[PDB]
Design a binder for this molecule. Structure first.
Ligand code: ACP
Lengths: 32, 960, 288
């Protein structure tokens, strides 16, 4: 409600999940 | 050390029987004791010395010391500089090691890919076995054109000349004799030195020393890349020093200035270009060697992509070299051999003694066996050791005769001269089978027209007939008829030595010929059809479309050479020679205009009297050339004369006498299954199989290397502009710095250096063999078009994408682009803690720095996003991605991994205190998507324009 | 570096040089076209009265008015030329706070003389015109004994440093909802003020630090809340933010004093990395 607090540590979790997904997809692709 | 004394005591010392040799059981018994016959290799590095050589060695120990000093300085109170230095050295060294420990491993495989063989005689049998396990006792055999396996004490020589060229270095071939000549082991004649090639003749010796206890046991592309790297590094150092001084003038506490200098230097130079080039060459060498195409040096890989002429012989290369007899000719009757087991057809009469004389001339000149133990195996499919024409004649005779070895043992030969290409005659003196007339037989073998002039008599239906002028015309007509079918024939004849003129005890001399070899009779000749290889016509077509001029330098008659050329495709349809044109027009060949014929057949005899200008004009004014009945010295003649007009000529050779031609030619191609060791070691390229389609495949690989290298270099160079432009605008326009040094390292030492390897695995384009060969002189790896396309068309769009992202973040946080100009002085001032933004708010220093570092991070992310499309468009430089496909998975792996690294660096907690990288909102990942799409669309359109109209302005000024 | 390369008989390393330069000019003009278009399309999606993101502007920092190069205030109270820079900077800042420049003209307004609740003048949009601003009187700071409207630290005493809170658009500071905090003024009242304190750095420096005096609106240490929230430069030009003059009466001569000033509150936060967010440090010393 207040435009002075952004919900970090939730963006960080999403970014790390996305990076892990990309890394796993690349590793699986090299193994195909 | 045993040449002084006789052979009986040397042979008993090593427990050897001179006639037989060593038993099989004793071979391993002595091998396991003494060990292998090979010189001890120099000691190998423990595989961690080179690691530290590349990390802590060279010009990197200074950077390591600086990083340690910066870390210490941070500890007592700075950290950024230490992290930057440590990252630079660690990543650069590790990458340079990974590409050096791979190329070395691949090149280690070529030592044992082709084996070294020696001809040992053990237990009364000669076998071609690897020369590593040569024991110090067995009896070995050496033949002209081979290299000795170990030190040999000659026991039975046959005029064998051994050229050392390794101790003395003199290329003069020294003859070898079984008798002692000098007490000095270094210049005696009994001893043959180790690792010395045998030029001519054949000698048998007993090995006295193996392994260490022996006499011997006591690229342009890289240069061009290095020059370009040195030039760009000079420019980078100049710019970096200038801007470092300027930053000090502006005032940046001597440590932000060093960071600026490091950022500029890292951004302006490609840090992994040379290792990438080396690994590209090595990977393509392995790919070439996987197919039957082996290269000795890495320079032959750089060449062979600019090949414009192939001078390949006929037999073995353009034909399978497994000849089955088809036709005969005797008594003016063209007979054909029916090879059926049941003897069907009965087209030929066997009872005539002309055929028994034919077997008695063509049955004992051959040196052919069947390894003794063959039962139930048909004579047609029985394996033979020897030549092809030899033992092809035996497959012919054995269907009629019934004794593989009995009849050959019935007589015995007293004279023997090995068949040689230059001498061309095969002679042997045999005792007659007749018990009342035991005369001495004489035999002939070679070119039918070269032997016909040696005969003034000819058998006809049973009895000799005098020299007939019509007989010569009949022989020529029969030769034409048999050669028109793409067949090679052998003309041979026999003569009985007079009984009273030559007493029946005379020794048959070898050097000084005393037997009459000028007035013999003539039995006949037979055909030996050799069909061409299956994949050869396709290879000749591929060469024709690729602008490679194929020249056949054969060694037999012009008619059969022309026939096999026409069958293969060397002489294309609709193209005619001057003699065929004259025959069509019934015109004398003298007055036929030579400009109406583009194919020519050159006889070898006429080639000896042709001058350099005549050879040059013959090569220049013809496109389909064959050289019939030539010798390897003449092969040197064509090889030398064909590169005088800017050609990269690759020639094939297998004999001992072909070595100067192979050395003179740009690419010397030896033979892996039929070539002598001299040619195999004097060449830059070995055909694991003699196919001539493997030559074209190797040429295709050599062409592909250049395309892949150009693509990788262009992709690596593209990302230099967006990493140097932000610093340019940071001082020219006075805006907050949009790119830090760690970010520059991530752009350069990250998404640029490492994914460039993935472009080396790209498949060959559709038109790879449909364009003219590259010019080694006027065409370079790095040219103005590549620099233009990298630094002015793609780099600028990438920089625009990064700057758009930077402006988006700065505007969304308050600082509109209007009042960003000229704010650099107050922005970077630590004493100003109330800087006013566009909306009127006031920021502390560490509150503006967070926004600036987020801008840096999203600049990095936008560079990654645009380099997605930059890597996609660099897959092809002539075709389109939609018609090329995403075949290689290494490229997609690189894309996913660079994006994963980008998304991990920003979002990982605790990375905003070490690398100064901050998380960016999800909306900011799509800032550079329009510019990536623009890059893709622009290159697709440009390549479509290039394909539509070749040779236009786009190709002239943009086709890198 | 060959001389036979500039102009043989046709041109300078190319034919007429025209098509390549024309192509590059058209290409770069087009690229500037897409860049300008994309920048404009981006500017369409942002607001004119409030920034898209304001989380980066954390609880606003605290700043003192004498801009000092190395957070040090070192001066000899004998020579007037030693403290000329500080006095000049204070005067340049306070020029806009003089009563001669605060005339209504449908711009300024007579604000309360005691701290009051925040004045919400409407929403952060353009249905109303330009907003009015509460006026600040320079006489509210004053001095215990000296020249009238004096902003100088003369031979006696120390320059009266002016403490100001950074402006954040649409920010309403929240005073703490408690009593007997680290701030112990003579008259302590939680609402309508943002308490500030100026103590020493350490025990060794709290000695002989003197009795600091806060000269603000209502004679209580704080920023009166009637001046908040800020409505932006476009909507509130000539907006006078509250000030707070702090004067150090007696101090040790020729002894460096490290003083840390805070601003306690509920919205106000503190960061370890940022030394100027919600608090600040100063260094003072007088030379004999
Ligand atoms: N062992 C042999 N004995 C007698 N004549 C032979 C022979 N081998 C080949 N010939 C014939 O004599 C000539 C030998 O010359 P050469 O051996 O160099 O030609 P070639 O048959 O090997 C074709 P290429 O040079 O392409 O391999 C040929 O014309 C061949 O028909």
């Amino acid at each position: 409600m207040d435009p002075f607090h952004y919900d970090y540590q939730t963006l960080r979790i999403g970014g790390l999940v996305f990076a892990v997904v990309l890394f796993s997809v690349g590793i699986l692709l090299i193994l195909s | 050390t045993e040449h002084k004394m006789s052979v009986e005591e040397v042979c008993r010392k090593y427990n050897t029987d001179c006639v037989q040799g060593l038993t099989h059981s004793k071979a391993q018994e002595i091998l396991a004791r003494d060990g292998p016959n090979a010189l001890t290799p120099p000691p190998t590095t423990p595989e961690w010395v080179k690691f530290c050589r590349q990390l802590f060695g060279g010009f990197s120990i200074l950077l390591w010391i600086g990083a340690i000093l910066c870390f210490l300085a941070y500890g007592i109170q700075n950290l950024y500089l230490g992290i930057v230095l440590a990252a630079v050295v660690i990543i650069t060294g590790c990458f340079s090691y990974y590409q050096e420990a791979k190329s070395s491993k691949i090149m280690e495989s070529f030592k044992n890919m082709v084996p070294q063989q020696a001809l040992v005689i053990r237990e009364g049998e000669k076998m071609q076995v690897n020369a590593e396990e040569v024991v110090v006792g067995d009896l070995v055999e050496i033949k002209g054109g081979d290299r000795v396996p170990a030190d040999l004490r000659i026991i039975s020589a046959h005029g064998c000349k051994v050229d050392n060229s390794s101790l003395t270095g003199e290329s003069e071939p020294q003859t070898r004799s079984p008798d002692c000549t000098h007490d000095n082991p270094l210049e005696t004649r009994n001893i043959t030195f180790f690792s010395t090639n045998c030029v001519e003749g054949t000698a048998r010796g007993v090995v006295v020393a193996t392994g260490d206890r022996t006499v011997m046991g006591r690229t342009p592309i890289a240069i061009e890349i290095e020059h370009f790297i040195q030039l760009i590094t000079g420019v980078a150092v100049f710019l970096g020093v200038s801007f470092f001084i300027l930053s000090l003038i502006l005032g940046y506490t001597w440590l932000e200035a060093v960071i600026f200098l490091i950022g500029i230097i890292v951004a302006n130079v490609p840090e992994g270009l040379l290792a990438t080039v080396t690994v590209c060459l090595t990977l393509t060498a392995k790919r070439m060697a996987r197919k039957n195409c082996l290269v000795k040096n890495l320079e032959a890989v750089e060449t062979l992509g600019s090949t414009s002429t192939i001078c390949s012989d006929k037999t073995g290369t353009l034909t399978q070299n497994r000849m089955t007899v088809a036709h005969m000719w005797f008594d003016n009757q063209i007979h054909e051999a029916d090879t059926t087991e049941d003897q069907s057809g009965t087209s030929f009469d066997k009872s005539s003694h002309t055929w028994v004389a034919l077997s008695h001339i063509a049955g004992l000149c051959n040196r052919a066996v069947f390894k003794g133990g063959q039962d139930n195996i048909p004579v047609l499919k029985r394996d033979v050791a020897g030549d092809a024409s030899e033992s092809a004649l035996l497959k012919c005779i054995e269907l009629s005769s019934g004794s593989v070895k009995l009849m050959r043992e019935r007589n015995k030969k007293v004279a023997e001269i090995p068949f040689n290409s230059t001498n061309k005659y095969q002679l042997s003196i045999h005792e007659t089978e007749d018990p009342n007339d035991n005369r001495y037989l004489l035999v002939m073998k070679g070119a039918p027209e070269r032997i016909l002039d040696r005969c003034s008599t000819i058998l006809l239906q049973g009895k000799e007939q005098p020299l007939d002028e019509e007989m010569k015309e009949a022989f020529q007509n029969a030769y034409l008829e048999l050669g028109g079918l793409g067949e090679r024939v052998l003309g041979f004849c026999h003569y009985y030595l007079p009984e009273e003129q030559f007493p029946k005890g005379f020794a048959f001399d070898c050097d000084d010929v005393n037997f009459t070899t000028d007035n013999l009779c003539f039995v006949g000749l037979m055909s030996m059809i050799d069909p061409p290889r299956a994949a050869v016509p396709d290879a000749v077509g591929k060469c024709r479309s690729a602008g490679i001029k194929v020249i056949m330098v054969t060694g037999d008659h012009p008619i059969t050479a022309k026939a096999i050329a026409k069958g293969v495709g060397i002489i294309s349809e609709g193209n005619e020679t001057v003699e065929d044109i004259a025959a069509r027009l019934n015109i004398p060949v003298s007055q036929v205009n030579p400009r109406d014929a583009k194919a020519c057949v050159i006889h070898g005899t006429d080639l000896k009297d042709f001058t350099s200008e005549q050879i040059d004009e013959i090569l220049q004014n013809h496109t389909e050339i064959v050289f019939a009945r030539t010798s390897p010295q003449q092969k040197l003649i064509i090889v030398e004369g064909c590169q005088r007009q800017g050609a990269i000529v690759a020639v094939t050779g297998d004999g001992v006498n072909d070595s100067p031609a192979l050395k003179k030619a740009d690419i010397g191609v030896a033979m892996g299954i039929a070539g002598s060791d001299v040619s195999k070691q004097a060449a830059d390229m070995i055909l694991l199989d003699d196919n001539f389609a493997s030559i074209v495949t190797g040429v295709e690989e050599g062409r592909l290397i250049f395309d892949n290298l150009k693509k990788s270099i262009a992709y690596t160079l593209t990302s230099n502009i967006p990493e140097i432009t932000p610093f340019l605008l940071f001082i020219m326009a006075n805006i907050p710095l949009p790119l830090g040094t760690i970010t520059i390292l991530c752009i350069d030492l990250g998404t640029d250096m490492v994914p460039a390897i993935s472009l080396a695995y790209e498949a060959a384009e559709s038109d790879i063999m449909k364009r003219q060969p590259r010019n080694p002189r006027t065409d370079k790896l790095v040219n103005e078009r590549l620099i233009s396309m990298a630094y002015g068309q793609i780099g600028m769009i990438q920089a625009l994408g990064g700057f758009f992202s930077y402006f988006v973040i700065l505007a969304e946080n308050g600082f509109l682009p209007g009042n960003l100009v000229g704010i650099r002085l107050n922005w970077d001032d630590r004493t100003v803690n109330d800087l006013e933004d566009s909306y009127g708010q006031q920021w502390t220093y560490e509150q503006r720095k967070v926004v600036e570092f987020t801008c840096h991070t999203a600049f990095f992310v936008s560079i990654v996003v645009v380099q997605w499309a930059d890597l996609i468009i660099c897959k092809t430089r002539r075709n389109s991605v939609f018609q090329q496909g995403m075949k290689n998975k290494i490229l997609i792996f690189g894309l996913f991994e660079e994006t994963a690294l980008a998304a991990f660096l920003s979002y990982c907690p605790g990375m905003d205190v070490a690398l100064r990288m901050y998380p960016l909102k999800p909306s900011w990942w799509f800032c550079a998507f329009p510019y990536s799409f623009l890059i893709f669309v622009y290159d697709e359109i440009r390549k479509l324009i290039l394909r539509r109209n070749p040779g236009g302005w786009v190709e002239k000024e943009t086709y890198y | 570096i060959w001389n036979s390369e500039k102009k043989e008989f046709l041109g300078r390393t190319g034919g007429s040089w025209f098509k390549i330069l024309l192509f590059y000019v058209i290409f770069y003009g087009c690229l500037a076209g897409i860049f300008i278009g994309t920048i404009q399309v981006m500017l369409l999606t942002i607001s004119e009265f409030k920034p898209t993101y304001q989380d980066r502007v954390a609880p606003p920092g605290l700043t003192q008015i004498p801009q000092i190069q190395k957070t040090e205030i070192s001066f000899r109270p004998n020579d007037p030329k030693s403290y000329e820079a500080y006095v000049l900077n204070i005067v340049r800042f306070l020029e806009k706070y003089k009563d001669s420049a605060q005339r209504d003209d449908m711009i300024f307004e007579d604000c309360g003389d005691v701290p009051s609740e925040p004045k919400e003048r409407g929403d952060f949009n353009h249905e109303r015109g330009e907003r009015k601003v509460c006026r600040f009187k320079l006489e509210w700071l004053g001095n215990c004994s000296g020249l009238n409207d004096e902003t100088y630290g003369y031979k006696e005493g120390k320059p009266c440093i002016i403490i100001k809170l950074n402006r954040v658009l649409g920010f309403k500071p929240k005073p703490p909802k408690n009593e007997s905090l680290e701030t112990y003024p003579v008259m302590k009242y939680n609402p309508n003020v943002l308490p500030v304190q100026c103590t020493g750095k350490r025990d060794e420096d709290k000695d002989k630090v003197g009795n600091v005096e806060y000269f603000g609106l209502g004679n209580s240490p704080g920023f009166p809340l009637q001046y908040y929230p800020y409505y932006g430069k476009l909507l509130q030009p000539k907006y006078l933010q509250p000030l707070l003059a702090v004067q150090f009466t007696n101090l040790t001569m020729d002894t460096e004093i490290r003083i840390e000033c805070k601003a306690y509150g509920e919205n106000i936060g503190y960061s370890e990395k940022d030394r100027f967010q919600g608090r600040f440090d100063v260094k003072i010393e007088v030379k004999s």
